[PDB]
Design a protein around this ligand. Structure first.
Ligand SMILES: *[C@@H]1O[C@H](CO)[C@@H](O[C@@H]2O[C@H](CO)[C@@H](O)[C@H](O)[C@H]2NC(C)=O)[C@H](O)[C@H]1NC(C)=O
Ligand SMILES: *[C@@H]1O[C@H](CO)[C@@H](O[C@@H]2O[C@H](CO)[C@@H](O)[C@H](O)[C@H]2NC(C)=O)[C@H](O)[C@H]1NC(C)=O
Ligand SMILES: *[C@@H]1O[C@H](CO)[C@@H](O)[C@H](O)[C@H]1NC(C)=O
Ligand SMILES: *[C@@H]1O[C@H](CO)[C@@H](O)[C@H](O)[C@H]1NC(C)=O
Ligand SMILES: *[C@@H]1O[C@H](CO)[C@@H](O)[C@H](O)[C@H]1NC(C)=O
Ligand SMILES: *[C@@H]1O[C@H](CO)[C@@H](O)[C@H](O)[C@H]1NC(C)=O
Lengths: 50, 49, 188, 302, 207, 49, 40, 49
């Protein structure tokens, strides 16, 4: 009965990886547990239409 | 404009009719007069004390 | 004056008028209260979902996107391409490059949650400072600019709407006119 | 000097006042996470003709057919046809054949709706207001020599800034050109741009965005929205090994994480915001009439 | 609340002459070709080719002129109005838009409590007017540019004077009642009589 | 000295193309004469279902 | 020839661009009137 | 209804044949055409519009 991590973060916490090199979304929840470098990309959110 | 010239004149309009309706409804006579300035009134420090 | 009024109301019919096919941003109330048609979605288990989960008043979107959470973004592109979707909250430059790929893919006007992509790291580790130093060294020169030129920056009168049917009708009426002239041959 | 002299020499702790980030500032102190998108910026002050030609040949062939049924408008109906595209009231010919009259009626109805569609297309062209762009970005040929183009223009930055360090690491020759193009006052440089004592100006992005968003008249022109620029951000500088850095970064991403940063962006920023000539198409008119008199000079020799 | 037409005239005065020259090359003839060009340029065999060319160019020129005159009169109207309190030429004003309020009014206190209105406050403290008719006569003689006031008074002033026009925003939707003393026996039946005027059309009679 | 680098198939950023013969990459060019600097990566073909 | 007072018909017809006037005064005046009709 | 009964008892008698129960049901009746007009609080109808 526990909240645990999955995906690239869950496999990084298990030590299966060494450094996430990916378009990783920076937010409060990830920064509580792992560390971030200074970002390379800056963008917001948008809606895709047809 | 006028430091000292005070006369009775004829005041009428919207709220005058409202006051006439209230005096027609409620049992009271009434005195109508203007205010000594041209201002509503704001909270301000007097320049003494 | 009737054909001038026809010019006037065709200018009213195709020039200025434009139905709202887009959403004009997050502050559209039609997506604040959805239905069976206005389908918005996000990628399954992303930080956009957690960011909308922290939003205390947008719980309707968080409880609605669970019907449409997708594994990969290509699933979302193919779903909105096949008219299964109607909106998709996503980061901007990815959809800009997909708009450079597919012309029908169009972003929205409003731009919110201005965040950043960096490099994921562990805890206290001897590879913490030099990665950020190399990234900032890439930002000070045009190496980021060259990577933008390779991927980010690189993208990829008419009268055919209501007069092409007129073109087909004029091209078809010639045969009927010549047929009426064969009727006049049958008279003469 | 300044805030770096206050923090490095430990007379303070951190700087809430804004600061750019380069390599030596990362050497002397440690920055926070970025909280606002603030780079740098520069401010300154087809087949229709083919199918109509095919339909013209169709009209000429049916006119030949009218000549065959029921004596000078055999191939000479071209002048009547493309004279009656435009309703010029030119005496051309009155066709005795009913087929030619019905065909010219269909042609003229198509021409009326064609010119109506062309007026609608010009109104749609009027919808798109063009915005000319003199400088495409930092890789402009204007950033190689100002006298390569016919007016030698001028641009600079603020003194003692890290943008000057970026220039001295990128373009020392353009730093030597900017030596004669320096300035002191930011609003003085704004007055220099308005009155004409300065052509372009390089500074940070959002400061110029806010000063252009309240610029009266909206005559100032930007270059894109931060495309070919430094692509950096603002942060808070802390000491090497500060105990507050983790909590400050968590609080900054929390303020990002609820739209409160977006609320302050909405509060503190307001990013608001043509004659009778078509001389491109008029130069096309001159070129086509030159081609027409060239074709007439070709037809003169027979 | 053209020169390009002169260029067209020079061009057609070249065109008619070269048309008569082409008629003279391979044949009142001069006046006949001139008057034929008079019929051509205003829309009232090798030379007929340049004639139909110039007729097409004349129609596309007059169609483009109809288009850009409609452009100049349709789109150039609605940029004159003020966008209310959220105007950046009022949020960040200058010495151009002159806006003010009545001296010692509660609207000034309402702007004073809101601490994001100090710039407009320091703008309007330069033009504090005594009465409303001062502001009316000053904006009437183009010595003002805007004025901050309640709704129905300015609606009545727009009804009296057609040049006075309000704005579209309706913010701080407040109410007017009857100013009173402290705890007093003249409190209950007054509000009862006001609401009795509200339940019938006596408020509409006053309207 | 060797770092395990995990990634996800990002549609503008991470392109996963099958090898030519066996563990090799076709070194194709860009529009500016730059060869596409590919790398050997290991991953599944589909998801868990 | 008979367009003395009968020029009203062709005059208001050339307002809308729907007899050939032989007079030079007629041609210049009809041209001015038709230019005014085009701008109208 | 009380304001109408203090204003127009005859129109209250006309509304006696014209009653309804559901607010959104009367909204649907306006959508289909089963009703010509509806007297209601103004800001709620502004939010519904
Ligand atoms: C980060 O990289 C720096 C170089 O930028 C490394 O520091 C160097 O370590 C060698 C060891 O022989 C010294 O000779 C150099 O003088 C050092 N350079 C500096 C900047 O002083 C360092 O080992 C790396 N690790 C971290 C994270 O500090
Ligand atoms: C004016 O205010 C007085 C307050 O004294 C009210 O008088 C009440 O009148 C009703 C009947 O109209 C009685 O039921 C109450 O007992 C009265 N109260 C008292 C003690 O006066 C009433 O609101 C108004 N009418 C007048 C003129 O008395
Ligand atoms: C108006 O005010 C002036 C100055 O006090 C006074 O002299 C004058 O009598 C007044 N006008 C009237 C109503 O008589
Ligand atoms: C008001 O009250 C007095 C008695 O106090 C009475 O004589 C008078 O008629 C009353 N006026 C009315 C009718 O309201
Ligand atoms: C303010 O001070 C002046 C003297 O400078 C005095 O005449 C005036 O009455 C004062 N204002 C108030 C609020 O009393
Ligand atoms: C992936 O490989 C497996 C082999 O176990 C195969 O069953 C599956 O169809 C493959 N999926 C594809 C084609 O991507």
């Amino acid at each position: 009965n526990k909240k645990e991590w999955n995906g690239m973060m869950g496999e990084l916490l298990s030590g299966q990886a060494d450094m996430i090199v990916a378009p990783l979304t920076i937010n409060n929840e990830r920064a509580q547990y792992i560390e971030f470098s200074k970002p390379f990309k800056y963008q917001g959110l948008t809606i895709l239409v047809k | 404009g006028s430091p000292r010239h005070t006369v009775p004149q004829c005041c009428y309009g919207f709220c005058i009719d409202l006051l006439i309706k209230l005096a027609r409804t409620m049992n009271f006579t009434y005195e109508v007069h203007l205010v000594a300035d041209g201002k509503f009134g704001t909270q301000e420090r007097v320049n003494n004390s | 004056i009737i054909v001038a009024s026809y010019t006037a109301n065709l200018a009213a019919f195709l020039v200025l008028d434009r139905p709202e096919e887009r959403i004009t941003g997050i502050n559209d109330p039609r997506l604040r209260n959805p239905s069976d048609k206005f389908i918005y979605a996000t990628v399954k288990q992303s930080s956009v979902d957690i960011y909308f989960r922290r939003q205390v008043e947008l719980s309707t979107m968080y409880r609605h996107m669970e019907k449409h959470n997708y594994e990969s973004a290509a699933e979302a592109i193919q779903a909105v391409r096949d008219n299964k979707l109607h909106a998709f909250i996503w980061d901007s430059a990815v959809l800009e490059f997909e708009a450079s790929q597919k012309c029908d893919l169009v972003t929205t006007g409003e731009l919110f949650f201005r965040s950043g992509f960096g490099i994921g790291m562990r805890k206290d580790s001897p590879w913490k400072q030099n990665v950020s130093l190399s990234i900032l060294k890439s930002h000070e020169n045009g190496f980021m600019e060259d990577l933008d030129k390779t991927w980010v920056r690189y993208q990829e009168t008419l009268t055919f709407e209501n007069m092409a049917g007129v073109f087909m009708l004029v091209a078809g009426g010639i045969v009927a006119g010549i047929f009426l002239i064969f009727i006049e041959i049958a008279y003469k | 000097n300044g805030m770096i002299g206050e923090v490095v020499y430990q007379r303070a702790v951190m700087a809430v006042g804004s600061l750019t980030i380069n390599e030596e500032r990362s050497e002397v102190v440690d920055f926070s996470v970025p909280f606002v998108e603030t780079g740098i910026s520069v401010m300154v002050s087809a087949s229709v003709w083919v199918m109509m030609f095919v339909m013209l040949l169709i009209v000429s062939a049916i006119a030949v057919f009218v000549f065959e049924y029921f004596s000078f408008t055999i191939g000479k109906a071209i002048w009547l046809l493309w004279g009656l595209v435009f309703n010029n009231s030119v005496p051309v010919q009155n066709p005795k054949g009913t087929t030619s009259k019905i065909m010219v009626s269909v042609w003229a109805f198509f021409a009326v709706i064609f010119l109506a569609s062309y007026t609608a297309n010009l109104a749609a062209f009027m919808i798109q207001e063009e915005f000319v762009d003199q400088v495409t970005g930092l890789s402009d040929k204007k950033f190689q020599r100002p006298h390569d183009y016919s007016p030698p223009f001028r641009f600079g930055t603020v003194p003692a800034g890290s943008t000057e360090r970026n220039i001295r690491n990128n373009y020392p020759y353009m730093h030597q050109y900017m030596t004669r193009f320096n300035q002191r006052g930011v609003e003085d440089a704004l007055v220099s741009l308005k009155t004409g004592k300065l052509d372009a100006f390089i500074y940070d992005a959002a400061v110029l965005n806010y000063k252009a968003g309240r610029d009266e008249g909206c005559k100032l022109v930007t270059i894109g929205s931060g495309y070919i620029f430094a692509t950096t951000g603002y942060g808070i500088a802390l000491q090497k090994g500060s105990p507050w850095k983790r909590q400050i970064d968590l609080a900054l991403l929390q303020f990002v994480g609820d739209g409160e940063m977006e609320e302050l962006e909405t509060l503190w920023l307001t990013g608001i915001c043509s004659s009778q000539l078509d001389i491109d198409n008029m130069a096309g008119v001159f070129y086509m009439l030159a081609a027409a008199m060239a074709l007439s000079l070709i037809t003169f020799i027979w | 609340k053209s020169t390009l037409w002169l260029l067209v005239g020079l061009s057609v005065h070249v065109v008619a002459v070269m048309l008569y020259l082409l008629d003279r090359f391979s044949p009142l003839t001069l006046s006949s070709a001139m008057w034929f060009s008079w019929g051509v340029l205003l829309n009232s065999f090798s030379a007929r080719i340049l004639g139909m060319v110039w007729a097409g160019f004349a129609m596309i020129i007059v169609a483009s002129y109809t288009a850009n005159l409609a452009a100049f009169l349709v789109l150039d109207r609605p940029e004159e109005r003020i966008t209310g309190i959220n105007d950046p030429r009022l949020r960040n004003p200058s010495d151009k838009f002159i806006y003010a309020t009545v001296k010692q009014s509660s609207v000034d206190i309402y702007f004073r409590r809101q601490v994001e209105l100090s710039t407009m406050y320091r703008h309007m403290e330069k033009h504090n007017y005594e009465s409303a008719a001062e502001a009316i006569q000053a904006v009437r003689d183009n010595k003002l540019h805007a004025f901050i006031w309640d709704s129905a008074v300015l609606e009545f002033e727009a009804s009296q004077k057609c040049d006075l026009v309000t704005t579209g925003e309706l913010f701080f939707r407040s109410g007017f009642g009857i100013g009173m003393r402290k705890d007093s026996p003249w409190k209950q039946n007054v509000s009862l009589s006001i609401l009795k005027s509200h339940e019938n059309g006596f408020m509409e009679d006053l309207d | 000295t060797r770092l395990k680098i995990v990634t996800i198939h990002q549609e503008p950023f991470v392109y996963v193309k099958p090898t030519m013969s066996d563990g090799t990459c076709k070194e194709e060019f860009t529009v500016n004469g730059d060869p596409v600097k590919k790398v050997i990566c290991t991953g599944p073909n589909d998801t868990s279902p």
